[PDB]
């Protein structure tokens, strides 16, 4: 069947880390050989499994979460972490089973002048729960007055844009990230490797 690991990795446009795109994969023959053997993926980590023995398992469902972030905020994509991305935008659990992949995309996501289309959530009155989204654009009240959906003093907008230019540094450059989460339940296994 060779399910679509190309519409996820090889796509022209990606999402913003506060609106990360999730795709469900089911009833497939999954080839994890292109990934484990490829000089493109700068970051390739795997938690709960060994990356050389992936074609030997059989899960029930797979979830592919895709987004774009800075180059220095990739260490925040892991269990038991802290930061602006791991508390307000995208949070992984602690009993995590899957694999994190990340690669540079300065040629597609950058632009002379600046690409201000990728955004992050900067302000939140609490911390996200694992695998939770928050697309609300309500106004952040940090003072004594109510904001009434109107910006002003100590009433700020929580979604703020990255600044991506080609002449930036490797730490302020864009990186595209795909998180694969395997789900093995009491039901049969519909995602097995090839033979």
């Amino acid at each position: 069947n060779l399910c679509p690991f190309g519409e996820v990795f090889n796509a022209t446009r990606f999402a913003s880390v506060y609106a990360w795109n999730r795709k469900r994969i089911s009833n497939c023959v999954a080839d994890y050989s292109v990934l484990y053997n490829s000089a493109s993926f700068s970051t390739f980590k795997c938690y709960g499994v060994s990356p050389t023995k992936l074609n030997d398992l059989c899960f029930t469902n797979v979830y592919a979460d895709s987004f774009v972030i800075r180059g220095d905020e990739v260490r925040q994509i892991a269990p038991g972490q802290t930061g602006k991305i791991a508390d307000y935008n995208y949070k992984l659990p602690d009993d995590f089973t899957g694999c994190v992949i990340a690669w540079n995309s300065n040629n597609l996501d950058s632009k002379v002048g600046g690409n201000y289309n990728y955004r992050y959530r900067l302000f939140r009155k609490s911390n996200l729960k694992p695998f939770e989204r928050d697309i609300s654009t309500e106004i952040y009240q940090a003072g004594s007055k109510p904001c009434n959906g109107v910006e002003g003093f100590n009433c700020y907008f929580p979604l703020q844009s990255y600044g991506f230019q080609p002449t930036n540094g490797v730490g302020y450059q864009p990186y595209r990230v795909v998180v694969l989460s395997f789900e093995l339940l009491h039901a049969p296994a519909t995602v097995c490797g090839p033979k």
Partner: antibody
Amino acid sequence: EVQLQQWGAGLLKPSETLSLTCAVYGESFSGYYWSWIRQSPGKGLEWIGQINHSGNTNYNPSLKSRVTMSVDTSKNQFSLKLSSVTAADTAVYYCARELGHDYWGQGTLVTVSS
Amino acid sequence: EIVMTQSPGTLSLSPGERATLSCRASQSISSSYLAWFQQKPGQAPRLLIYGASSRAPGIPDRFSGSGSGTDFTLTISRLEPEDFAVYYCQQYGDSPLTFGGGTKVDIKR
């Protein structure tokens, strides 16, 4: 007109531990983040972190390893613990509200020496 | 950590005259999120300007802001005794916050 009152240790010694406490009067302790900010000569101002009533913390990667924040909701109090203090931690520490634009403390000078 | 740098590190003027301070970032800042703090001896910092152009309440009409991107500027129409202090630039468009070094204002004779 939120009022903030600080206290804690003054003189310390190397490799000791620094503990400070700021208390709040005049508004709801919950619904806001409470931050710590230190000022030294030559190194200007600096942001350490902030804590919430639910116990959720934002820290600065420079000091992520040494800082520990705590909160007592009943008393309307928050507290900071900074470990392995060297002589470079001599500075004036203030407790402030989220994005200190509105309200600050009065200051607590902390000095390290042998 | 966006690094902010103030200009000049020191300044010397006399009453009546106008003052112009500057702040410069290492990378472009968010919309205009750039605040200006005042600080006198013994007291704590006081905010004057938010959003790089807006004037906070209880502030005299002589403090003005301008600029964007990586270059911002604060202007003082007519200096007054209460205006001689240490000024700081702050950015809250990213995490963590970062203040500038400082820019003193001394009297001239």
